[PDB]
Write a protein of this length. Structure first.
Length: 75
DNA sequence: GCGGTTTTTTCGCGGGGGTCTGCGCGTTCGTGCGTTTTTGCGGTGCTTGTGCAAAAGAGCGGCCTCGGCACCGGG
């Protein structure tokens, strides 16, 4: 895993702090969340690279991300 | 639901060195200048055709009196 394990834990807790106050986490929940997040982001970067190559470029730009999320059907 | 075991999460500290960052020059790729090949709406001259004053005689149709006859009623 490329992201670390403690900043990601803090991010997850911060996000979870909105839906219910003072929620405990479990052995393999944060690990699964990190695996899913990194897999998702790698797929998104694959699609972004495809779009950037389509535009005859090598640099990925935010509009490529936006196009990828639009075609995937993401809101 | 309640008691058990014991893993691996949370807690804190020290050290390393890869990653971030200040600084410079160059270039490659982003942006504007100019153009290629073609599509489209703009108009015309000409073709082909349209709706908007008596006088007089001659001739005529209707008509009417009349001629003349056949006919009903009776013996």
């Amino acid at each position: 895993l490329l992201i670390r394990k403690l900043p990601f834990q803090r991010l997850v807790r911060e996000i979870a702090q909105d839906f219910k106050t003072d929620l405990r986490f479990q052995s393999a929940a944060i690990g699964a969340l990190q695996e899913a997040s990194e897999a998702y982001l790698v797929g998104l970067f694959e699609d972004t690279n495809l779009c950037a190559i389509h535009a005859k470029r090598v640099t990925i730009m935010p509009k490529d991300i936006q196009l990828a999320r639009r075609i995937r059907g993401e809101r």
